[PDB]
């Protein structure tokens, strides 16, 4: 039977029901390195969990390509006056090399 | 003096309020339900059992041959036979010729054994709600008494006014059609009002307990005797009433959500947990004090020793104090993080004492307030292992917050610097001109 914090109550032959609020489980551990922190944070919620850790990755992951594509449009910013490179001028003495 | 709030439904949690009265010291007050009895409002249809066929005797003639005629009864059958020439014991056997005489009437009726067992029918509307509660405040003891549920109902528990209710919600376990036999009840949404259905559930089904019309069928039939010898041959289908004693799904006190029990005589649906309550309570004004006679507090100490989350009380603190005079003075927790098992506590000259709580947080923050005076507590870490938690998403821990905050600010901070070489880039191109 899988019991849940709202609890459970059965009953057998003409015996009196009986009720269990079963819980409080704790399989993992909260503190240490990433992975068994997961692995708490996947156990406590049997799928709000799991669904949370999707999401999550989702998210995290969409962040850094929009971050990524943002980085390389600044970069082709930054590429962009280099249009006076092929002109054969002064260094500029930036973050780029100019002999 | 009144207070005003409102409180979760439940049969067991107590509930613990502090009221002020400014120029006063403050006064708690505990209240705590112990039912909530749901009452419908129905009326009965009929009521049905197992049947029985009666029989008189038959009547036949040495010679010749009658009619039979119809009686108002309950399903009357009548029917003549030809024929006969029957025997009997060492008699003359009633005849000389073709006899051509038989009576053969049945009769149906309600069985001797209706007035025990026999299922009944009901028609359910809203009804009423009440309950009762057991109360405690100040210094008086627990005092209980019943009232109804309704914004207008006062009842007076001791020297106290109450008003509660209405509930939060309208729900209930009933349905339109109910019936209800022996122990239990049973959503068997379609009786029949006046239709039998030859032995299903509705084939004898008197309009009260003790009626006199059984408007209902059993598909009863004769038959024609035989050899003859005296006797009445019939058939029909077997009552439907024993059917449905057998084949009864699930009684409605076993699929019942939010576990509530159902007691029979008023069709009590007791105990059913769901939504909260406003409630509004008066005081009299002689119970409270001059708030120059309590003993001030200051000088405030709170440390935490050792706390678990679980359901029971499974976190102690201790509280370092330096008094004014020695007395008594409540303790009570305003915010809803943690609950305090304690009430009120003694305090003597330099307090230094220590209590009990529950939690359902891995880093509690409750902040308490003594004797008109306040505290924050901030606790600590506590390791993992019915009763009062929150659980509101706020088990977030430190490891958690602080990746979840390293990795906002990770995206934040790319995604604005790059934003700041855009126009780093542009101005270049602005000025160039």
Known sequence: ?99 | YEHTAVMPNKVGIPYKALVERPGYAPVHLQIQLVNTRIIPSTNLEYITCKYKTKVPSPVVKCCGATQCTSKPHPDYQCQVFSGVYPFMYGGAYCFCDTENTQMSEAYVERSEECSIDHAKAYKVHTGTVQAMVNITYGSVSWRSADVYVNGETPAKIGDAKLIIGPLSSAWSPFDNKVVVYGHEVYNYDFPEYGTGKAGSFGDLQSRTSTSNDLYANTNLKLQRPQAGIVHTPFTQVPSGFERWKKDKGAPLNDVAPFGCSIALEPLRAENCAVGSIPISIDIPDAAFTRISETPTVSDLECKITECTYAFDFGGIATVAYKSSKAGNCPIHSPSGVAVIKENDVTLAESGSFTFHFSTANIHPAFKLQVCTSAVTCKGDCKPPKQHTESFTSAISATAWSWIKVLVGGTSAFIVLGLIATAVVALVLFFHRH
């Open chain 1, 1 to 99: 039977f899988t019991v849940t914090g709202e609890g459970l109550e059965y009953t057998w032959g003409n015996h009196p029901p009986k009720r269990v609020w079963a819980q409080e489980s704790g399989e993992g551990n909260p503190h240490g390195w990433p992975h068994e922190v997961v692995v708490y944070y996947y156990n406590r919620y049997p799928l709000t969990t799991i669904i949370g850790l999707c999401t999550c990755v989702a998210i995290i992951m969409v962040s850094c390509v929009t971050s990524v594509w943002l980085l390389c449009r600044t970069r082709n910013l930054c590429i962009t006056p280099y249009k006076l490179a092929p002109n054969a001028q002064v260094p500029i003495l930036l973050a780029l090399l100019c002999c």
